[PDB]
Design an enzyme around this catalytic site. Structure first.
Site, short mmCIF file in Angstrom:
data_model
loop_
_atom_site.label_atom_id
_atom_site.label_comp_id
_atom_site.label_asym_id
_atom_site.label_seq_id
_atom_site.Cartn_x
_atom_site.Cartn_y
_atom_site.Cartn_z
N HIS A 164 -7.48 -5.69 -1.14
CA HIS A 164 -6.29 -4.89 -0.85
C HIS A 164 -5.63 -5.31 0.44
O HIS A 164 -4.40 -5.33 0.54
CB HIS A 164 -6.67 -3.41 -0.71
CG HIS A 164 -5.48 -2.52 -0.51
ND1 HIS A 164 -4.41 -2.51 -1.38
CD2 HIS A 164 -5.15 -1.67 0.49
CE1 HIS A 164 -3.51 -1.63 -0.95
NE2 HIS A 164 -3.94 -1.11 0.18
N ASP A 180 -8.34 -5.73 -6.03
CA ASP A 180 -7.76 -4.67 -5.18
C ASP A 180 -8.01 -3.34 -5.88
O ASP A 180 -7.66 -3.17 -7.04
CB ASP A 180 -6.27 -4.93 -5.01
CG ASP A 180 -5.57 -3.95 -4.06
OD1 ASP A 180 -6.19 -2.93 -3.74
OD2 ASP A 180 -4.40 -4.21 -3.70
N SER A 208 0.85 -1.21 0.00
CA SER A 208 0.00 0.00 0.00
C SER A 208 0.89 1.26 0.00
O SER A 208 1.78 1.37 -0.85
CB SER A 208 -1.05 -0.07 1.11
OG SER A 208 -2.16 0.79 0.87
#
Ligand SMILES: *[C@@H]1O[C@H](CO)[C@@H](O[C@@H]2O[C@H](CO)[C@@H](O[C@@H]3O[C@H](CO)[C@@H](O)[C@H](O[C@H]4O[C@H](CO)[C@@H](O)[C@H](O)[C@@H]4O[C@H]4O[C@H](CO)[C@@H](O)[C@H](O)[C@@H]4O)[C@@H]3O)[C@H](O)[C@H]2NC(C)=O)[C@H](O)[C@H]1NC(C)=O
Length: 260
Positions: free
Chosen positions: A247, A194, A133
């Site tokens: 995600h 995601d 991320s």
């Protein structure tokens, strides 16, 4: 273009780096015993957290960044203003995500000092950079910078945003031999739908680099696709919106869960 399936050896490598990246949210909980945990990378103003690590079994010095674990980090994640990558001016016309650049500049000097010290003690070890991320884009910017000094840099990202513009993607593709999966040193790992690899939008001037390794459920070596080129495909064709379950969980490991 795409093919389905990767080697077990590559798959296990992606899983290993996903584990380190997801453990970075919880003080590197439950990472392999073969890793020696070094200095904590930290800046209080940006709340960037990471570590330098060494694995004497795989002969690598690993720099890992934590993704968002605070509202301070969220302020970085959501700043989409493109800015010149001025720490690496040899990257011609390169611009990067403005929030991640703010994070990077806050820890650059510490990161570079630690890597220089460790590389001098272990000169034939690879330099690996990883994160999930926000930490994935921190890893991307760091790996770009390091690649100009060191010839053996590898980058493994998980749920990586578009970290910069096409100039930056192209610089990274060249530096990390992305033109074939057989040579690539940049593994841009994505999962199912995601939403984060869709952000910021390409329409704002952003682009991905790397070879995309697209993990589809149920995760395994055989269910990981290898996606090359700049056509819309794989994760970026799934229409995922923002931070979704895909995600947060890569190879079955949820950020900070520590159940691995
Ligand atoms: C989102 O990310 C982007 C990209 O990383 C950030 O955009 C950059 O932001 C900086 C900071 O604002 C900006 O730098 C300014 O450039 C101007 C030149 O074009 C300078 O004039 C300006 O100087 C002022 O601020 C400095 C402190 O930041 C001071 O050192 C200096 O003395 C100046 O101070 C005056 O103005 C400030 C601000 O109003 C005021 O507080 C002071 O009292 C005094 O009046 C800056 O150096 C870059 O131009 C931006 N880059 C781009 C591409 O746009 C953006 O900031 C990020 N968002 C957040 C919230 O952090």
């Amino acid at each position: 273009a795409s093919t389905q399936g990767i080697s077990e050896d590559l798959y296990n490598r992606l899983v290993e780096m996903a584990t380190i990246s997801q453990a970075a949210y919880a003080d590197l909980c439950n990472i392999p015993s073969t890793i020696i945990k070094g200095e904590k990378i930290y800046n209080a103003q940006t709340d960037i957290n990471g570590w330098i690590l060494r694995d004497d079994t795989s002969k690598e010095i690993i720099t890992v960044f934590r993704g968002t674990g605070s509202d301070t980090n969220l302020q970085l994640d959501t700043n989409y203003t493109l800015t010149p990558f001025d720490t690496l001016p040899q990257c011609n016309d390169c611009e990067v995500h403005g929030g991640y650049y703010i994070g990077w500049i806050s820890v650059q000097d510490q990161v570079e000092s630690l890597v220089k010290q460790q590389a001098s003690q272990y000169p034939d070890y690879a330099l690996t950079v990883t994160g999930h991320s926000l930490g994935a884009s921190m890893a991307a910017l760091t790996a770009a910078q390091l690649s100009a000094t060191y010839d053996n840099v590898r980058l493994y990202t998980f749920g990586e945003p578009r970290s910069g513009n096409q100039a930056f993607a192209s610089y990274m593709n060249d530096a990390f031999q992305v033109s074939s999966p057989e040579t690539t040193q940049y593994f841009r790992v994505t999962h199912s739908n995601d939403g984060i690899p869709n952000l910021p939008p390409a329409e704002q001037g952003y682009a991905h680099g790397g070879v995309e390794y697209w993990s589809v459920d149920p995760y395994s070596a055989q269910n990981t696709f290898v996606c090359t080129g700049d056509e819309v495909q794989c994760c970026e064709a799934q229409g995922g919106q923002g931070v979704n379950d895909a995600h947060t969980t890569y190879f079955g490991m949820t950020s900070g869960a520590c159940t691995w």
